[PDB]
Every structure is written in structure tokens, then in C-alpha cells.
Design a protein around this ligand. Structure first.
Ligand SMILES: CC(=O)N[C@@H]1[C@@H](O)[C@H](O)[C@@H](COP(=O)(O)O)O[C@@H]1O
Ligand SMILES: [Cl-]
Ligand SMILES: [Cl-]
Ligand SMILES: [Zn+2]
Ligand SMILES: [Zn+2]
Lengths: 381, 385
């Protein structure tokens, strides 16, 4: 654009709650943001709306019928369009376990769409995972992390692979974590039967993210705490959680938030390709997924295979279920849905502040998305 | 009575860490506490020792060969003498699940020792329980909480029953919790297969304590969190934890401390009658117990017969495993072993402060007890441990 001055009764910047607030947008940047009456006459008076920074979804597999694992322009476009429509202005595309050949093709294909700007990075969830915690993955393809293949895969992405999930109990997992962190890649722990001690070792080797805490993860036990306690204990780790109301009980979300504090939890969707569509049978990598009432299940089991949630939905549920008063709930959920995930992944600092890119979301009273701006242009006007 | 002046390199009062510190004792009361040099020449300089308030053990079954469930002067005296020598200056004696007539006799007999001053209260850990997990005491006598029997048992205690463990899923549990709170008794949640929702209902009905969190309790599951999460979530609840290194992993104790904060965890021993006994085989109530390297087992079996922890041991393990630097660790451990449990049970607020009873413990640099004072007199005088 050129000159936009927005007002709204509430503006959350990432670190403060402005009531009322205003933002001045020039081209694709925020030039200025503040509380009270605006420094000039406003162009857009949003009224009784809440403005938050754009949502930063760092772990999702598709949407609107599109699968990121397809690594085609059409499927990526329809996934990006749906999530962007719901306020996810930054997206890390996740790949499920795959054979070496398909992995290179998928990484190369997605890396092109990063460079094109459709997605902001690649997450490799697999193949270096535990077969005991596979879920919606093909366990046959999981393998020990080999430093030759890791280098080949990172070479193919040309710096666009941002995060790799590792099962810390596989042979060569601790070397692979060091190898990833030397390449500037975030090492995440997930899909693992690791003990407390093995997860603690992975953290000391440089893992800094917990992949959807409590899902595909050994449970907490009084004598063997398991990975979830190692991950919540260490302040260097940002834990992911899927708060769609299906993957973990809301009281678990509340418990972990209590434990790790406001800066150490990231909300994610793990959205699959049926997000935004109708019910039926779908595809995730090389698997068939039956979505019944929006609940994704691997065809023929009881295993939930991913969510059908957008960041707008998990934001709303975080606010409702975090147990804090409304204003504090909004502030917390903005840290979890915008600030913490961008920080954890080395992404452009989320936040509405002078010089930041103008990515923001307008929420109505019920906290539904009414507008979405990305790079200073309305995606949803 | 005259004023005794004590000095030590470090005095923890329950809220402050004084370095150096001093305390003035008159009769059985603390007169004054302060930092720096004493007001006069001290009657005893404890030197390079750390003084803490007396330990408050709110859940234990015996020690030194005595079972509180015996409800005799001889068994209670032996248990009290053992734990007192390791710094527990306040004790709440626990009874396991028992038959209705045996329950009344045990309560009646322990109430007399409350009135005599050997113990400070009674905890009924049973019979209104409902778990078969390891830790179950006598599950064939577990039964629904009948308000008639509760009134009869509370009457028998003449106000000395301070805590009652309730499994929240039994018919009548929520009513029993309301009945206990109205009678001024603490309702604890424990020995239960209750869901998260059923436990949160018990908390809304007035339960304020979790009986040895994670032990004898449904575990945490991602879709059914179980009672431990309801108990850690609610600020009204003080959770018990047995930190002897065996009942819960040290990192679980850190996790829970990190979750609930410094005010909401109590260290307990759940000590059984073999606590503090030398290696050997012993007749303790209805069981032959074999003690090997301080671990008690029923003779002829590999099965561990419960905790043999003293408050001295759990305090030292709490300081070692809480993951804080030493001074912050001592300050947390004093809250968990002294202030939080006394407050949860409505006991005389622990702490070395003007007006408080003179109950304190002297520890060396290894955090071993070297002296114990209770009501202004040395139970264990410095050097005699
Ligand atoms: C793509 C993928 O792997 N998604 C996982 C799924 O595998 C797992 O079954 C589910 C719950 O796992 P849980 O039953 O251990 O919580 O979480 C995620 O949806
Ligand atoms: Cl997932
Ligand atoms: Cl016990
Ligand atoms: Zn995933
Ligand atoms: Zn007990």
C-alpha cells in the first residue's frame, strides 16, 4: 500500500496490550504503533476489534485439500491460501517420513516454494523417528539418522530446512543433533520412546524444540519421567502443543503452560490436508486418513493422525482454556501463537513494532478472524 | 525464665536466610531473631552450622520399630523418639485402612497421645480409599464413606483427627469431603482411580491436600490427565511428595515444584515402623521385616515394605535435587519441610519468629542433623547425634 493508519479498541503487539491502539502502515512495514488516540486521522477504524500479530504456524502438513508432501505448486497454493485466510501469515511446511529419493524430491520441491514466498521453511518430521511412536507415519521407512543423508537433504533445501524432528534413542541421534545445529537447523525431539536421560542428552547436544508434547511421546511416569519432563525442565526448549481439543486434554495444556511459563510454549496446528474441507477419506504422505466430524484418524484404527485446525482455532482454544483472565489470556496466547514459535525457529521476529513486516490479524468479539494483512496488504479485507 | 542466646553461621527462619544469625529463647518460646552479631555474648555458638525450623512430618506410620497403628504408649514413644532425633519436631500419625471397630480403638488410643503431646494429630489414610495399585495398604477393607461412621470416628478423636484421605470416585465421597471440612478436618485426595474431573470436583467440595502425589494414584495421560493434574492445577491444594529417591524420580519432584511453586508442596516421609533400625529381621506388627542396607522388605520376599525415610533424609534430597543453587535450595526445602505442611494441616505456623515455639534443627555442611531443639529444650543436644 502507501499510507494506512488503523485504529482498534485493542491492539496486542507481542509484548503489550494497547487499549485503544493504532498502527501506521507504509508499504509492507509497520512504521509506528501506539496506545491512545492516533497521531493523525485514521483511515480504517476497526472499532470493537482485537488486532494481534499474524499467526506463525511452525508445524503443519497441508490444508484446503493440499498436501505439502506432494511438493507441487497447486497443492502448496491451496494449503497456503486456506491457512493464510485464517491468519497464519508465516508457515513452516512439515514433511512426514519418506524414502530417501522422495525425501530429496519433496525437499527440493518445497525449497522452491520457500524461495517463492508461499511457505517460510521446511520441517522434516521423519524419517529419523521411533517405530514404536509412528502414528500417521509409515514405520517401515523410519531409519537411523545417517550424516551422509542428512547432508544430502540439507544440501537439497539450500538453507530452507528449518527444523528436523529426531528420536533421541536411535543410534547416531546425538551426532545428528549436533550436525543439524551446526548447519543452523533447529533440532526437535519427538516421535520417541526415549527416556528422561536420553532426552536430556539430546537437549544438551542442542535440541531446542519439543515436537507436539505428549503426542507420539512416551508418557510421564513416576519412576521414568520420559521426554516430556526433560523437555519442560530445560529453559532452552520451546515445547509445541496441539490445542485443538482432541490431541491433549485442555488441563494438560494448562499444566504445561504453568510449568514452562509464557515464553516456552508454541501453539501449532499439525493441520492435515482435510483442514477446511468436508469429511471423508484423505491422504497424508503414503497413508489413508478417515476424517469423521473433523477428527482425523488413520484408516482403520483409533489413532488420531493430525488435526483439522487452523491457527485461528487453536488461538481461540488457548485463550479459553489457559485458565487466565481474558486480557492475560490474550497476551499469553499471542506469545504462544506468534512470538514464541518465530523465536524458536529463528523466523523474522513476530510482533507489531516499528520496522517489522506488517503481518496482522483482526479478531471480532468471539475471536473469529475478520481480516488478515500480510506484507501490508489485505489478504482478507 | 532466663533467655538463651544461640548463634549460627546461617539461620533460616522460614521466610528469611540470616547470615550470620541469632535467636533468643525463653522457656519454650522464641523471643527474638536477628541477623549479624548477637545482642550479647551467646550461650551457645553453633559455629559453621545451618539452623532451620523443626521439620513438620504430616504423613508417617511409625519408626524405630513402633507402629502408630498399634496405638500404644510404647510403640508411639519409639516412633516419636526416632523421628524427633532426626529433626521432626511435629508429627501427624497416620493410620492405614482398618475395620470399623479397630479404627475406633486406634483413633481413641492415638487421641490420648495427641493430648499427651507425643504427636500433634491423626491422619486417616483409609478406609475410604479405592485403588489396587502398588502402595495399597489393606484394600479388602476399603469401603464407601458412610457419614455415620465418619461422625463416630471424628467423635472418638475429640478433635485430634487432622487429615482424612478420600478417594473421590466412591459413592458418597463428595459428601464426605464436605462433612470433613465442616468438622475442621483436612480432606486429602489419594489412593484413587478418580479421573481429572472427579478430582476437580473433590477440590471444589473442599479437598486441599494431595496424599503422596503420583504414588497409589492413576497416572497422567494426555487425554485423561488424572488426579495429579487437578491437584497441581488448583492453588488451594498443597501436594505431598515422598522424596526419598525411590517413590518418585528426582526430576518428577523438580517438575512438580516448578509447576506448583514454593508454597504448594509438602515433603513427607510416609515412614514405616522399620525406619531408623539397624540391619536385621524384626517382628513389626503382623509381619517379619528384613532390613538390608536400610531398605525394609517382608522377610522371605523381595517386596519393599514402604518408605524408611526420615525428614532429615528427604530434606537433604530435596536440597540436592531441586536444581537451585544451595541458598535458594535451602530456602525452598525449609518451606516444603516446615512451613507448607504446617500451614496445610492448620498446625502452629512453623518458623523461627518472635512468639513461635522454639523448635529448630541444627545441620552441618553435609546437611546432617547435629542437634534438635523442641519447645526450647534439646531433644538432641549438639554433639549427641
Ligand atoms: C502426523 C503425525 O504423526 N501426527 C501425530 C500422530 O501420529 C499421533 O498419533 C497423534 C496423537 O499421538 P498420541 O496418541 O501418542 O498422543 O499426534 C499427531 O496427530
Ligand atoms: Cl503431526
Ligand atoms: Cl503411604
Ligand atoms: Zn506433524
Ligand atoms: Zn501412608
Amino acid at each position: 500500500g502507501s499510507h494506512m493508519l488503523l485504529t482498534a479498541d485493542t491492539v496486542l503487539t507481542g509484548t503489550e496490550l494497547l487499549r485503544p491502539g493504532w498502527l501506521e502502515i507504509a508499504s509492507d512495514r509497520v512504521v509506528a504503533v501506539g496506545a491512545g488516540a492516533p497521531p493523525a486521522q485514521a483511515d480504517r477504524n476497526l472499532g470493537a476489534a482485537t488486532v494481534v500479530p499474524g499467526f506463525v504456524d511452525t508445524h503443519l502438513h497441508g490444508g484446503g485439500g493440499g498436501n505439502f508432501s506432494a511438493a507441487t505448486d497447486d497443492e502448496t497454493a491451496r494449503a497456503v491460501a486456506l491457512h493464510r485466510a485464517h491468519g497464519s501469515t508465516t508457515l513452516v511446511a512439515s514433511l512426514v517420513t519418506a524414502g530417501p529419493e522422495d525425501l530429496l524430491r519433496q525437499v527440493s520441491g518445497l525449497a522452491r516454494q520457500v524461495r517463492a514466498g508461499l511457505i517460510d521453511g521446511i520441517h522434516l518430521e521423519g524419517p529419523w523417528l521411533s517405530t514404536l511412536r509412528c502414528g500417521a507415519h509409515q514405520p517401515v521407512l523410519m531409519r537411523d539418522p545417517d550424516p551422509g543423508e542428512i547432508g544430502r537433504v540439507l544440501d537439497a533445501g539450500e538453507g530452507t530446512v528449518r527444523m528436523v524432528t529426531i528420536a533421541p534413542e536411535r543410534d547416531g541421534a546425538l551426532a545428528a543433533i549436533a550436525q543439524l545445529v551446526n548447519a543452523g537447523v533447529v533440532a526437535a525431539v519427538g516421535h520417541t520412546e526415549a527416556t528422561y536421560d536420553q532426552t536430556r542428552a539430546a537437549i544438551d547436544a542442542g535440541a531446542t524444540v519439543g515436537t507436539h508434547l505428549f503426542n507420539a511421546m512416551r508418557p510421564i511416569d513416576r519412576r521414568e519421567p520420559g521426554p516430556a519432563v526433560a523437555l519442560t525442565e530445560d529453559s532452552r526448549v520451546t515445547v509445541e502443543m496441539i490445542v485443538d481439543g482432541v490431541h491433549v486434554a485442555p488441563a494438560i495444556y494448562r499444566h504445561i503452560t504453568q510449568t514452562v511459563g509464557p515464553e516456552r510454549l508454541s501453539l501449532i496446528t499439525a493441520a492435515m490436508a482435510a483442514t477446511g474441507m468436508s469429511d471423508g477419506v484423505y491422504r497424508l504422505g503414503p497413508l489413508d486418513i478417515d476424517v469423521v466430524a473433523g477428527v482425523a484418524r488413520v484408516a482403520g484404527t483409533d489413532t488420531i493422525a493430525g488435526s483439522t485446525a487452523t491457527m485461528e482455532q487453536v488461538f481461540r482454544l488457548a485463550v479459553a482454556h489457559c485458565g487466565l483472565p481474558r486480557d492475560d489470556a490474550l497476551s499469553l496466547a499471542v506469545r504462544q501463537a506468534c512470538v514464541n514459535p518465530a523465536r524458536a525457529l529463528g523466523l523474522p521476529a513476530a510482533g507489531l513494532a516499528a520496522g517489522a513486516r506488517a503481518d496482522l490479524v483482526v479478531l471480532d468479539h468471539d475471536l473469529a478472524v475478520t481480516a488478515v494483512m500480510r506484507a501490508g496488504e489485505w489478504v482478507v479485507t
